[PDB]
């Protein structure tokens, strides 16, 4: 995935071949591990973009993306 930013915050452009794998990227505050559980398809015009909240010792609820060290934005296409 391509690591960029959205208003100072890290942003992940996730491609199709990353479905099912732990997303890791270094940050001043250590290594960040986001988990993507998404309709994740091929990167195209039909993108969706939203935030993966920070979750410390809390079970996830009503979400398919979350990181454990620093909240991150994520973007991926839905095409197939």
């Amino acid at each position, epitope marked *: 995935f391509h690591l960029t930013t959205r208003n100072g*915050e890290p942003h992940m452009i996730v491609s199709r071949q990353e479905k099912g794998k732990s997303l890791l990227f270094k940050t*001043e505050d250590g290594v*960040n591990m986001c988990t993507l559980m998404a309709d994740l398809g091929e990167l195209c015009e039909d993108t969706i973009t939203y935030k993966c909240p920070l979750l410390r010792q809390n079970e996830p609820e009503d979400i398919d993306c979350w990181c454990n060290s620093t909240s991150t934005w994520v973007t991926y296409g839905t095409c197939t």
Partner: antibody
Amino acid sequence: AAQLQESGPELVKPGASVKISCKASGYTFTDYFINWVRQSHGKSLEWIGDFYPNNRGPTYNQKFEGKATLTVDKSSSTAYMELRSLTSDDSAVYYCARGLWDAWLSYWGQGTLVTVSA
Amino acid sequence: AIVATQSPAIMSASPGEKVTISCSASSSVSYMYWYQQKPGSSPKPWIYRTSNLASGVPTRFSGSGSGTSYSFTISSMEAEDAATYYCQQYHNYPRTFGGGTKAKSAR
């Protein structure tokens, strides 16, 4: 164990170009931003660049757009700054600091002095 | 695309005094920093976010602010404080520095 190792001090003539290296170690080079930083003698710091070595996206401070050109070699975990058409005002230190998610310069290099002189 | 403007350019102080150093951004950011730079040394990070100490920073330093205002505070100056200190913003592209504040000993 995070370290940045800049090149050594450079003279140089006006109209020359220089080519400052940056050699990261003790972290995933691809994972973090690389940020050059002018400081002239008796001035403050002056941000210049930022280069994400996963995808080789720059940005530039407008003031240094046309003056600088950032580039990274993944293979050697090295960042490079060219400076072009050097003038006496370009005489400064140039520090390479890595970011850590946000724009926060959390590890600096030892700083390359460049000294533009006739 | 935002300037940062840091309040005393200088600053005389004596050991024990409680220095304060402000930073004023031309639009609302939440990601700042305060570096510290010694006469023949790299800058070091001292504050991160708007109020996070960096690890291996004395609890003598503190950072607070929001809404374009931002403020370093040195709660009882040590000899080893004497330095420049340096706001950033890292909330929009061209990451900006302030013009630096130059805390020097007095007598």
